[PDB]
Each structure stands twice: as C-alpha cells, then as structure tokens.
Amino acid sequence: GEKIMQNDRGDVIIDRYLTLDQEFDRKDDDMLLHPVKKIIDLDGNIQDDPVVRGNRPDFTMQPGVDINGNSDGTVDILKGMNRLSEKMIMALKNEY
C-alpha cells in the first residue's frame, strides 16, 4: 500500500507482473461487485436525482491531482486496502 514512484529500481523479473496484478485486481472486482441492499445503496442514493446539475464541488472534494491534472495515486492505495479487506472478509464466506 505504499505509494509507488518511478525513481525506485524495483526488480526486472518481478515488475513484469504488475500488469498481471492489475488484471487480477479487475478480476477480483468482478466477483466482489454485487448489488447491495437499499439500506446501504449509495449509488442509488446519488442516482436518485439523475438530472441534478448543481455546482461542482471544490478541489478538496475530489481525489488529488498532479500538476498535469492526472491522478496522483493516493486513491489507488485506498482502493487497494479496501480490496484487501473485502478479500479478507470474502475468504471467510466459504464451505469451511
């Protein structure tokens, strides 16, 4: 979950598996993603009004961006730890 930056060497044998790990993350999101109850359906909560077009909230309400406007990767570690906890909880849901 540490923020990855480009000046580190990494390892040439292991760093080719980064794309495969992102592919596995998408695959994990595939069977993690399921419809939830309306008690905790925040997507339904924000899509209750589909045509709302108010003021776009200030930059403290969006993920942080670089000088070029691209994502800084801070949301990526949040996604990673959320996916880690979901994997830990989903591993409890089995035949054991």
Site residues (CB under 8 A) for another protein?
Answer: 1-3, 32-34, 36-56, 58-69, 74-75, 77-79, 81-82, 85-86, 88-89, 91-94, 96
Identify which of residues 13 and 67 has a Cβ nearer to another protein in the complex. 67
Instruction: Round to whole Å and give the CA distance between 11 and 39.
Output: 46
Least Å distance, CB 27 to another protein, is 15
Least Å distance, CB 14 to another protein, is 21
The CB density around residue 86, as the number of other CB atoms within 10 Å, is 14
Instruction: Round to whole Å and give the CA distance between 48 and 40.
Output: 13
